[PDB]
């Protein structure tokens, strides 16, 4: 039935045998079927992709085309019914710190990416969308509802463009839609490195044979590294400040410098690999250039896994946490480790713990300036606020003194993100994550929220009140309600989101299921997981299980008074310790004697 399978624009696969490390790619991570969890491959379906017309059309793209009965409501609409709130006051996390939000954004880039199709360069049809609203081909256009004030000062709509897709990149008509994941499915630093052989060079520093990465020769933080710039235009981190001519930066993930907190924490990462590539030369001098990269390459990839999976997982998780991530057992080459299509939206839960403002720190943390505190959207694609102002050190200081947003269900999503966000090429800071986000559901052809709730073992809720009692919110649910005439209608993203939080986590029994499994799955699929018998010697195994965030700051910054628990809500000058009382990284296990 299920067919030997498509693979068109796909390359060749050939797997060097007794390689240690990683490729690129992610190719040949598996053995028996080598192009698993790779770049440039189909999400994986976890269950039969929902389509209009059960092929590629998103449902809501023709009027006369309800779904279940109904139609489905304006991604918009839904998003100014439910999503949006005014009063920021009270929404802060009291046992989260922002950079608790921040180490999500870091693992969801590392591992998926669905880029829009390409069509629009050189060819006006970008602007076609924009300009007079027109739904066609991948032009998807969110519509504003008719009591939208957007409508007055904006226009009609909100252009959108579909996820490329596999195969063809004009439309093909015999299996479903399935989207690119243009990352590889590994928690495999490739935010860091690239994902492309073409990027990954790139990205490197080949002059010396030092192995480092390659750094900004234009501007310095008090002697510290700052990523290189992109030099391609246009560019929207010129954009937004057109005087300072500040350019984005070039790092192995294509959206690093969004914000300027994820920015900023892929700074920290590049350094990390320097310092990294700088120690193991000196331990081991006779080492090649490549061997310096490779080596260092592994060791931030085991950082990333052991702060995600040991410090972050279980409080995203909690309760939750054992039932779907039972302690390692060691590389199973039967798990599938691609990132299903559903969890690029599972994992969105991030965006209602993003708050209203950024600020900087001074050394005894306190207000950096006139202006500490920003709004968050002067800071989408703002490159200019970190060279010209201050460097990397007081922002981190704001991400380990401050708190996150708290998921909550009468404010999920703050407006800087709901009205004001700003997307590349187009010209304004009036944009909607929420909006975006669900419609994007509707472009992947995702299967509705009971589905998923079926698809969990948990019960599919058909009235009003059965809705109620799933999300302990009577006003909530008559609002769905309204808007989706069904439960069985409901867009998973804010499904899923809508569930009250599970105790000692931060996500629904839902989430915690489809996130859960997904994780599960991405390390014990993994043949290069640090833990993995063989991969690290077990001298180096207990090196690196002392690991830290904090260690990572003291390390990569000047700042030298860190908490202990990083992602736990920490306050000046009581729960922060001098950096001296923090465990570091001690490298000598890695020292090669080959005599
Ligand atoms: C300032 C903070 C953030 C900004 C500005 C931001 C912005 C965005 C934007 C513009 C997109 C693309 C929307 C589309 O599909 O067209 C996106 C997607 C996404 N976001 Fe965020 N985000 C933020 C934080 C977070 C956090 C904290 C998480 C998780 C903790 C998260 C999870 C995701 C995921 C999983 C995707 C889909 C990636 C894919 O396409 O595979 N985001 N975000
Ligand atoms: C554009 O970037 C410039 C350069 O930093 C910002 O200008 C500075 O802001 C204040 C003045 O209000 C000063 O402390 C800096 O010395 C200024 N530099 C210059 C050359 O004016 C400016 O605020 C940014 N503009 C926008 C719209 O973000
Ligand atoms: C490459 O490394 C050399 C030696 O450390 C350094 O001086 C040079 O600035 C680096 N080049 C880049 C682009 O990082
Ligand atoms: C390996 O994966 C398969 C499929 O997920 C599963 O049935 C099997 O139990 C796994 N092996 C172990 C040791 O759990
Ligand atoms: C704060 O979070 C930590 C985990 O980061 C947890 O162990 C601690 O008990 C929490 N405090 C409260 C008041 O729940
Ligand atoms: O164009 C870019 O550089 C990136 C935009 C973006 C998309 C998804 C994110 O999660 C963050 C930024
Ligand atoms: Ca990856």
């Known amino acids: 039935s299920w067919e030997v399978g498509c693979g068109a624009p796909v390359p060749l696969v050939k797997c060097d045998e ?23 491959r189909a999400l994986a379906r976890w269950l039969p992709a929902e389509y209009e017309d059960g092929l590629a059309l998103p449902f809501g793209w023709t009027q006369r085309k309800t779904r ?26 009291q046992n989260r710190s922002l950079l608790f939000m921040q180490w999500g954004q870091i693992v969801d880039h590392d591992l998926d990416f669905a880029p829009e199709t390409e069509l629009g360069s050189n060819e006006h ?23 939208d004030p957007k409508l007055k000062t904006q226009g009609k709509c909100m252009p959108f463009f579909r996820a490329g897709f596999v195969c063809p990149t004009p439309p093909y008509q015999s299996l479903a839609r399935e989207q690119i994941n243009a990352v590889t499915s590994f928690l495999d630093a490739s935010l860091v490195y690239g994902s492309e052989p073409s990027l990954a060079s790139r990205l490197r520093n080949l002059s010396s044979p030092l192995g480092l ?11 510290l590294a700052y990523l290189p710039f992109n030099n391609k235009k246009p560019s929207p981190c010129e954009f937004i400040n057109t005087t300072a001519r500040v350019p984005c930066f070039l790092a192995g993930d294509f959206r690093a410098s969004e914000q300027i907190l ?34 260092a390459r592994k060791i931030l990839g085991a950082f990333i896994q052991i702060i995600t999976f040991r410090d972050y997982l279980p409080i995203v998780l909690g309760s939750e946490m054992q039932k779907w991530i039972p302690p390692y057992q060691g590389y199973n080459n039967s798990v599938d480790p691609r990132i299903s299509n559903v969890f690029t939206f ?84 009036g944009f909607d994550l929420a909006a975006i986000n669900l419609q994007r559901c509707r472009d992947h052809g995702m299967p509705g929220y009971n589905s998923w709730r079926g698809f969990c073992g948990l019960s599919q809720p058909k009235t009003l009140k059965g809705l109620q009692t799933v999300l302990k919110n009577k006003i909530l649910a008559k609002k769905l309600m309204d808007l989706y005439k ?59 299980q002392k690991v830290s965030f904090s ?11 860190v908490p202990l628990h990083a992602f736990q809500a920490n306050n000046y000058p009581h729960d922060f310790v001098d950096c001296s009382t923090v465990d570091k990284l001690d490298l000598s296990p890695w020292a090669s004697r080959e005599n």
């Open 18 to 40: 007794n390689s240690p490390y990683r490729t690129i790619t992610g190719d040949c991570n598996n053995r028996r079927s080598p192009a698993l969890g790779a770049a440039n």
């Open 68 to 93: 279940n009965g109904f139609r489905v409501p304006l991604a918009r609409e839904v998003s100014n019914k439910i999503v949006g709130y005014l009063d920021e006051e009270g929404v802060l996390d």
């Open 125 to 147: 049809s970008k602007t076609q969308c924009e300009e007079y609203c027109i739904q066609g081909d991948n032009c998807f256009p969110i519509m504003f509802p008719k009591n």
């Open 213 to 223: 990465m390659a750094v900004n020769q234009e501007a310095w933080d008090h002697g």
């Open 262 to 295: 994820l920015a900023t924490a892929h700074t920290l990462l590049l350094r990390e690999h320097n310092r990294l590539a700088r120690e193991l030369k000196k331990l081991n001098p006779h080492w090649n250039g490549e061997k310096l990269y490779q080596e």
């Open 346 to 429: 599972a994992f969105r839960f991030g965006h209602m713990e993003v708050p209203s403002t950024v600020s900087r720190l001074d050394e005894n943390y306190q207000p950096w300036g006139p202006e500490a505190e920003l709004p968050l959207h002067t800071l989408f694609f703002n490159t200019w606020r970190i060279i010209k102002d201050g460097g990397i050190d007081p922002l981190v200081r704001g991400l380990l003194a401050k708190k996150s947003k708290l998921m909550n269900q009468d404010k999920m999503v703050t407006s800087e993100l709901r009205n004001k966000l700003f997307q590349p090429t187009h010209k304004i800071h």
């Open 486 to 544: 069904t439960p069985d209608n409901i867009d998973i993203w804010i499904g899923g989101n809508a569930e009250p939080m599970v105790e000692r986590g931060r996500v629904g029994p839902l989430l915690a299921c489809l996130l859960g499994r997904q994780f599960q799955q991405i390390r014990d699929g993994d043949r290069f997981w640090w833990e993995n018998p063989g991969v690290f010697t077990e001298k180096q195994r207990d090196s690196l």
């Open 551 to 561: 260690r990572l700051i003291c390390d990569n910054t000047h700042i030298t008074k």
